[PDB]
Short mmCIF file of C-alpha atoms and ligand atoms in Angstrom, two decimals:
data_model
loop_
_atom_site.label_atom_id
_atom_site.label_comp_id
_atom_site.label_asym_id
_atom_site.label_seq_id
_atom_site.Cartn_x
_atom_site.Cartn_y
_atom_site.Cartn_z
CA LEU A 1 0.49 -0.06 0.34
CA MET A 2 0.85 3.84 -0.20
CA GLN A 3 1.08 5.19 2.33
CA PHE A 4 1.14 9.77 2.67
CA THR A 5 4.49 10.23 5.17
CA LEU A 6 5.87 13.80 7.00
CA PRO A 7 9.18 14.95 7.22
CA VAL A 8 10.23 14.20 10.87
CA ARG A 9 9.87 16.94 12.61
CA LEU A 10 6.01 17.66 10.69
CA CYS A 11 4.96 14.10 11.59
CA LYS A 12 5.68 14.84 15.05
CA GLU A 13 4.58 18.39 15.48
CA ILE A 14 1.18 17.89 13.62
CA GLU A 15 -0.59 16.60 16.56
CA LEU A 16 -0.06 19.73 18.57
CA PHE A 17 -2.86 21.84 18.27
CA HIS A 18 -0.84 24.34 17.52
CA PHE A 19 0.83 23.52 15.09
CA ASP A 20 1.32 25.86 11.50
CA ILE A 21 0.84 24.21 8.33
CA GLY A 22 4.13 26.34 6.98
CA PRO A 23 4.55 28.52 3.87
CA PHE A 24 4.80 25.52 1.33
CA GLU A 25 1.54 25.58 -0.31
CA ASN A 26 2.52 22.68 -1.70
CA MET A 27 3.18 20.33 0.67
CA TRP A 28 -0.56 21.85 2.47
CA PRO A 29 -2.98 18.89 0.08
CA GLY A 30 0.12 16.56 1.30
CA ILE A 31 -0.29 17.06 4.80
CA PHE A 32 -4.36 17.16 4.50
CA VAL A 33 -4.16 13.74 3.58
CA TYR A 34 -2.37 12.70 5.93
CA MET A 35 -4.43 13.82 8.63
CA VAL A 36 -7.17 12.88 7.06
CA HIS A 37 -5.66 8.61 6.74
CA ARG A 38 -4.94 8.85 10.33
CA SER A 39 -8.12 10.03 11.54
CA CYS A 40 -10.69 8.61 8.87
CA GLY A 41 -8.74 5.66 7.93
CA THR A 42 -6.31 4.93 4.38
CA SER A 43 -9.57 3.20 3.79
CA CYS A 44 -12.35 5.73 3.97
CA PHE A 45 -11.77 7.19 -0.12
CA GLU A 46 -10.16 6.49 -3.19
CA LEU A 47 -6.58 7.95 -2.98
CA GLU A 48 -7.37 9.29 -6.43
CA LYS A 49 -11.16 11.24 -6.04
CA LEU A 50 -9.77 12.88 -3.02
CA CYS A 51 -6.68 13.75 -4.73
CA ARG A 52 -8.78 15.49 -7.42
CA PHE A 53 -11.53 17.06 -5.05
CA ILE A 54 -8.43 18.36 -2.69
CA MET A 55 -7.29 20.24 -6.10
CA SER A 56 -10.85 21.57 -6.83
CA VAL A 57 -11.77 22.64 -3.69
CA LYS A 58 -8.13 24.54 -3.84
CA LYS A 59 -8.61 26.23 -7.17
CA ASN A 60 -11.91 27.45 -6.28
CA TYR A 61 -10.11 29.45 -2.96
CA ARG A 62 -9.43 32.81 -3.76
CA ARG A 63 -6.18 34.70 -3.65
CA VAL A 64 -7.53 37.18 -0.47
CA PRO A 65 -5.11 37.79 2.61
CA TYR A 66 -7.32 35.64 5.22
CA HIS A 67 -9.75 33.62 3.49
CA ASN A 68 -8.20 31.80 1.85
CA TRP A 69 -6.54 27.96 0.87
CA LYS A 70 -3.80 28.16 3.82
CA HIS A 71 -7.14 29.27 6.37
CA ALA A 72 -9.41 25.98 4.78
CA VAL A 73 -6.38 23.19 5.66
CA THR A 74 -5.27 25.65 8.99
CA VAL A 75 -9.09 25.27 10.39
CA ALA A 76 -8.69 21.87 8.90
CA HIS A 77 -5.44 20.48 11.24
CA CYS A 78 -7.20 22.06 14.10
CA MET A 79 -10.67 19.60 13.31
CA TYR A 80 -7.48 16.91 13.14
CA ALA A 81 -6.31 17.98 16.60
CA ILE A 82 -9.59 17.53 18.01
CA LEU A 83 -10.58 13.92 16.38
CA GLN A 84 -7.51 12.98 16.99
CA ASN A 85 -7.50 13.56 21.50
CA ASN A 86 -11.22 12.48 20.99
CA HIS A 87 -10.94 9.45 18.70
CA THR A 88 -13.71 7.40 20.87
CA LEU A 89 -16.52 9.92 20.53
CA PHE A 90 -17.25 9.94 17.26
CA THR A 91 -18.91 8.16 14.00
CA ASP A 92 -17.51 6.85 10.60
CA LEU A 93 -19.61 8.95 9.36
CA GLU A 94 -18.13 12.29 11.64
CA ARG A 95 -14.28 11.62 10.43
CA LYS A 96 -15.22 11.00 6.86
CA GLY A 97 -17.58 14.53 6.88
CA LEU A 98 -16.19 16.72 9.18
CA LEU A 99 -12.08 17.31 8.03
CA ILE A 100 -13.49 17.99 4.57
CA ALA A 101 -16.42 20.24 5.84
CA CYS A 102 -13.16 22.04 7.33
CA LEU A 103 -11.07 22.03 4.12
CA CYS A 104 -14.44 23.66 2.46
CA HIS A 105 -16.05 25.97 4.74
CA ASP A 106 -14.52 29.14 3.32
CA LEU A 107 -14.37 27.58 -1.07
CA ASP A 108 -14.83 31.25 -2.55
CA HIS A 109 -14.70 33.67 0.36
CA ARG A 110 -14.17 37.25 -1.63
CA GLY A 111 -13.11 38.38 2.40
CA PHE A 112 -16.78 39.94 2.57
CA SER A 113 -19.28 40.11 5.73
CA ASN A 114 -22.80 38.29 5.49
CA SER A 115 -23.46 42.67 6.15
CA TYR A 116 -21.28 43.52 3.77
CA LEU A 117 -23.49 41.56 0.89
CA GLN A 118 -26.58 43.14 2.01
CA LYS A 119 -25.49 46.98 2.54
CA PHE A 120 -23.95 45.93 -1.27
CA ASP A 121 -27.37 44.17 -2.71
CA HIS A 122 -25.32 41.45 -4.02
CA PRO A 123 -27.29 38.58 -5.30
CA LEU A 124 -26.28 36.04 -2.49
CA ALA A 125 -27.99 38.42 -0.52
CA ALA A 126 -31.18 37.64 -2.66
CA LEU A 127 -30.33 34.22 -2.82
CA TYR A 128 -29.55 33.22 0.92
CA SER A 129 -31.51 36.05 3.23
CA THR A 130 -29.33 34.53 6.47
CA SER A 131 -25.95 32.93 7.02
CA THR A 132 -25.21 34.68 3.61
CA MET A 133 -21.73 33.53 3.09
CA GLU A 134 -21.66 30.13 4.49
CA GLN A 135 -24.84 28.85 2.84
CA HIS A 136 -22.66 29.76 -0.68
CA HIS A 137 -20.00 27.82 0.59
CA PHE A 138 -21.35 24.88 1.41
CA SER A 139 -23.48 25.15 -2.73
CA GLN A 140 -20.11 25.12 -3.87
CA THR A 141 -18.84 21.92 -2.26
CA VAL A 142 -22.19 20.29 -3.46
CA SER A 143 -20.76 21.58 -6.85
CA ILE A 144 -17.83 20.33 -6.42
CA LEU A 145 -18.56 16.90 -5.39
CA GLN A 146 -20.99 16.92 -8.49
CA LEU A 147 -18.17 17.27 -10.82
CA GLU A 148 -16.74 13.84 -12.57
CA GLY A 149 -14.49 11.70 -11.03
CA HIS A 150 -15.18 14.06 -7.76
CA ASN A 151 -18.24 11.56 -5.80
CA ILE A 152 -15.15 10.77 -2.54
CA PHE A 153 -18.72 9.27 -1.06
CA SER A 154 -18.94 7.07 -4.04
CA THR A 155 -18.66 3.78 -1.70
CA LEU A 156 -21.82 5.23 0.80
CA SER A 157 -25.10 4.35 0.43
CA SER A 158 -27.36 6.55 -0.08
CA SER A 159 -28.89 7.35 3.19
CA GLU A 160 -24.95 7.64 4.54
CA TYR A 161 -23.97 10.00 2.14
CA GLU A 162 -27.11 12.25 3.14
CA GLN A 163 -26.48 11.69 6.09
CA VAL A 164 -22.78 12.93 5.78
CA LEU A 165 -23.75 16.05 3.33
CA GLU A 166 -26.01 17.07 6.37
CA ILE A 167 -23.21 16.54 8.48
CA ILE A 168 -21.00 18.97 5.92
CA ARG A 169 -24.12 21.53 5.58
CA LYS A 170 -24.11 21.81 9.19
CA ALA A 171 -20.21 22.12 10.24
CA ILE A 172 -19.96 24.81 7.39
CA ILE A 173 -23.29 26.71 8.41
CA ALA A 174 -22.23 26.91 12.41
CA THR A 175 -18.96 28.80 11.11
CA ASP A 176 -21.37 31.75 10.85
CA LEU A 177 -20.06 33.89 13.56
CA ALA A 178 -23.79 35.28 14.56
CA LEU A 179 -24.87 31.72 15.24
CA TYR A 180 -21.96 30.26 17.13
CA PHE A 181 -23.13 32.77 20.29
CA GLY A 182 -27.12 31.04 20.50
CA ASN A 183 -25.22 27.95 20.12
CA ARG A 184 -21.97 28.30 22.70
CA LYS A 185 -24.99 29.10 25.51
CA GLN A 186 -27.38 26.43 24.87
CA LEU A 187 -24.19 24.19 25.51
CA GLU A 188 -23.45 26.03 28.62
CA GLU A 189 -26.57 25.78 30.36
CA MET A 190 -26.77 21.95 28.98
CA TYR A 191 -23.43 21.20 30.13
CA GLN A 192 -24.28 23.00 34.13
CA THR A 193 -27.59 21.48 34.41
CA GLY A 194 -25.89 18.42 32.95
CA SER A 195 -28.45 17.83 30.13
CA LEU A 196 -26.23 17.41 27.41
CA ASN A 197 -25.97 13.87 26.01
CA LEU A 198 -23.73 13.01 23.05
CA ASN A 199 -26.84 10.32 22.38
CA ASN A 200 -29.02 12.72 21.01
CA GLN A 201 -28.37 13.91 17.01
CA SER A 202 -29.29 17.71 17.97
CA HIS A 203 -26.72 17.61 20.86
CA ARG A 204 -24.26 16.47 19.22
CA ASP A 205 -25.24 19.24 16.44
CA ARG A 206 -24.84 21.89 18.44
CA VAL A 207 -21.53 20.18 19.80
CA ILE A 208 -19.79 19.81 15.87
CA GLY A 209 -21.30 23.48 15.69
CA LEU A 210 -18.74 24.53 18.60
CA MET A 211 -15.69 22.49 17.10
CA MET A 212 -16.41 24.02 14.22
CA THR A 213 -16.43 27.96 15.76
CA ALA A 214 -13.00 26.19 17.46
CA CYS A 215 -11.68 25.56 14.28
CA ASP A 216 -12.47 28.18 12.60
CA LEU A 217 -11.12 30.55 14.66
CA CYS A 218 -7.89 28.57 15.78
CA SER A 219 -5.36 31.66 14.86
CA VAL A 220 -6.17 32.28 18.54
CA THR A 221 -4.42 29.21 20.09
CA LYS A 222 -1.17 29.38 17.88
CA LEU A 223 1.79 30.63 19.46
CA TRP A 224 2.29 34.34 19.55
CA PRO A 225 3.86 34.95 16.79
CA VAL A 226 2.13 32.97 14.34
CA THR A 227 -1.33 34.68 15.95
CA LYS A 228 -0.01 38.16 15.53
CA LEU A 229 1.43 38.23 12.15
CA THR A 230 -1.89 36.18 11.55
CA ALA A 231 -4.04 38.39 12.96
CA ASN A 232 -1.96 41.28 10.17
CA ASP A 233 -4.46 39.64 7.82
CA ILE A 234 -7.89 39.22 9.02
CA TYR A 235 -7.44 43.42 9.36
CA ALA A 236 -6.03 43.37 5.98
CA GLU A 237 -9.76 42.41 4.75
CA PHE A 238 -11.44 43.99 7.59
CA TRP A 239 -10.03 46.94 6.37
CA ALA A 240 -10.47 46.43 2.48
CA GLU A 241 -14.77 45.61 3.49
CA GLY A 242 -14.43 48.87 5.57
CA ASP A 243 -12.88 50.64 2.70
CA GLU A 244 -16.18 49.15 0.16
CA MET A 245 -18.83 50.50 3.36
CA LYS A 246 -17.29 54.07 3.28
CA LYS A 247 -17.70 53.61 0.03
CA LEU A 248 -21.77 52.69 -0.18
CA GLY A 249 -21.83 56.06 2.24
CA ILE A 250 -21.78 54.13 5.18
CA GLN A 251 -19.63 54.36 8.04
CA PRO A 252 -17.87 50.97 8.93
CA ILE A 253 -17.95 49.07 12.42
CA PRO A 254 -14.41 49.77 14.07
CA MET A 255 -13.16 46.48 13.27
CA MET A 256 -12.97 47.55 9.78
CA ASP A 257 -11.93 51.52 9.96
CA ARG A 258 -7.77 50.88 8.90
CA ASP A 259 -7.91 55.04 10.24
CA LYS A 260 -8.33 53.22 13.96
CA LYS A 261 -5.35 50.41 14.22
CA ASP A 262 -4.70 52.02 17.20
CA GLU A 263 -6.92 50.43 18.59
CA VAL A 264 -6.26 46.81 17.25
CA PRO A 265 -5.15 46.06 20.58
CA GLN A 266 -7.44 47.12 22.45
CA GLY A 267 -10.49 44.80 19.80
CA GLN A 268 -8.62 41.61 20.09
CA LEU A 269 -8.26 41.77 24.05
CA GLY A 270 -12.85 42.95 23.99
CA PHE A 271 -12.66 39.70 21.18
CA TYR A 272 -10.62 37.62 23.06
CA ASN A 273 -12.60 38.39 26.34
CA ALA A 274 -16.53 38.68 24.78
CA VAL A 275 -15.72 35.17 21.85
CA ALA A 276 -12.59 33.34 21.88
CA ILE A 277 -12.25 32.69 25.57
CA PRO A 278 -15.63 31.66 26.23
CA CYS A 279 -15.61 29.39 23.27
CA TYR A 280 -12.67 26.88 23.99
CA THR A 281 -13.86 27.54 27.51
CA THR A 282 -17.22 25.90 27.19
CA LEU A 283 -15.16 23.50 24.72
CA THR A 284 -12.94 22.43 27.62
CA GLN A 285 -15.80 21.34 29.24
CA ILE A 286 -17.57 19.58 27.17
CA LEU A 287 -13.67 17.86 25.42
CA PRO A 288 -11.48 18.33 28.53
CA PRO A 289 -8.69 16.86 25.66
CA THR A 290 -9.56 20.33 23.99
CA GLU A 291 -7.67 22.11 26.81
CA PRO A 292 -4.47 22.88 25.00
CA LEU A 293 -6.31 25.12 22.96
CA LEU A 294 -8.07 27.21 25.97
CA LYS A 295 -4.31 27.31 27.15
CA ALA A 296 -2.85 29.07 24.30
CA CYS A 297 -5.57 31.18 24.39
CA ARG A 298 -5.19 32.25 27.10
CA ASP A 299 -1.69 33.06 26.75
CA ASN A 300 -1.99 35.38 23.81
CA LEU A 301 -4.97 37.01 25.90
CA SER A 302 -2.02 38.07 28.40
CA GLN A 303 0.36 39.22 25.30
CA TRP A 304 -2.86 41.45 23.84
CA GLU A 305 -2.55 42.97 27.77
CA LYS A 306 2.03 44.16 27.10
CA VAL A 307 0.35 45.38 23.46
CA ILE A 308 -1.82 47.73 24.89
CA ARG A 309 0.95 48.43 28.24
CA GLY A 310 3.38 48.92 25.53
CA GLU A 311 5.77 45.78 26.34
CA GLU A 312 5.01 44.56 23.42
CA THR A 313 4.51 46.81 19.58
CA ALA A 314 2.37 45.49 16.38
C1 IY2 B 1 -15.15 37.45 11.16
N1 IY2 B 1 -13.51 36.81 11.79
C2 IY2 B 1 -12.87 36.39 10.86
C3 IY2 B 1 -12.97 37.06 13.58
O1 IY2 B 1 -13.68 37.80 14.02
C4 IY2 B 1 -11.75 36.55 14.22
C5 IY2 B 1 -11.52 35.02 13.09
N2 IY2 B 1 -10.29 35.04 14.36
N3 IY2 B 1 -10.01 36.73 14.99
C6 IY2 B 1 -8.93 37.01 15.50
C7 IY2 B 1 -10.95 37.56 15.02
C8 IY2 B 1 -11.01 38.85 15.10
O2 IY2 B 1 -9.58 39.58 15.21
N4 IY2 B 1 -11.94 39.63 15.31
C9 IY2 B 1 -12.35 40.54 16.18
C10 IY2 B 1 -13.58 40.76 16.14
C11 IY2 B 1 -13.64 42.14 17.13
N5 IY2 B 1 -12.79 43.28 16.82
C12 IY2 B 1 -12.96 44.56 17.39
C13 IY2 B 1 -12.24 44.91 17.12
C14 IY2 B 1 -11.56 46.60 17.44
C15 IY2 B 1 -10.95 46.40 16.52
C16 IY2 B 1 -10.18 48.32 15.62
C17 IY2 B 1 -11.29 49.01 16.46
F1 IY2 B 1 -10.92 50.54 16.80
C18 IY2 B 1 -12.02 48.91 17.36
C19 IY2 B 1 -12.10 46.92 17.84
N6 IY2 B 1 -10.75 43.95 16.39
C20 IY2 B 1 -11.96 43.04 16.61
C21 IY2 B 1 -11.01 41.24 15.79
MG1 MG B 2 -16.92 31.37 6.94
ZN1 ZN B 3 -13.29 30.42 7.99
#
């Protein structure tokens, strides 16, 4: 059999939650296949169809600062680490669906929020009133799955195929941060009343939703230099959207105004306190082996406080 192998450093370090997939684009497909073979199994997919699928997915990501092919693979890798360290908790179909969902979750992203598309009156806002881009991302996933030689689930029954596409749809839609706030509240109450039940499919859906938020935001769980450098790419997009909001004669929110760049450290602080820390806190409560994500989030929260006190530059 042909078994994907990684260099010695990558082989060890890919198992760590804070792994950076590196600047070599051409290695990312191999890194993804390796993660599928270990998290799912070498018999989960035909290698030729998976490779064809990977390259078609890559081609439908755009040359944008942040919401790009590197983000897709980075998000899948965070999902890999969660699956590997919680391997008894997930099903055959969930391992198949969830790495694919992560790879595909920002397909055809142009670097603009759902809000910009609504204000711009983009056709996608007419087609999908809520979770606009996320419904677009899923649609793009269905299109690619339906290309000749791209049915990577061809061995699944009709009913299993439908289940996995439903895992992928719900996982992709969960990456709408607007939905995260409600989902985390429900999970927090369920955990704290001791009512959360992983044998309940509506509960599994919420847990996978949280996992998808955690994976999508995972730049806050990297080592500080990766965290800081990724934040430049995030803001590069936010500021381009703010420019576009100004062009429509609309005041952009502060995070999207390139003139407000000196307030970034305080905005980061607000984001760690309102979104990130609660997210990885609730995830750790449910999946205790995800602890390193929360530990690394607290470490970066401390780093942003050092930037605010003038003991670090950005
Ligand atoms: C949507 N995405 C991708 C994310 O939210 C996302 C994912 N990963 N990360 C790290 C983010 C992220 O940085 N979010 C935020 C969220 C709120 N903010 C508010 C401010 C702020 C800036 C200047 C100012 F003057 C006032 C406030 N800056 C942010 C940044
Ligand atoms: Mg997205
Ligand atoms: Zn994303």
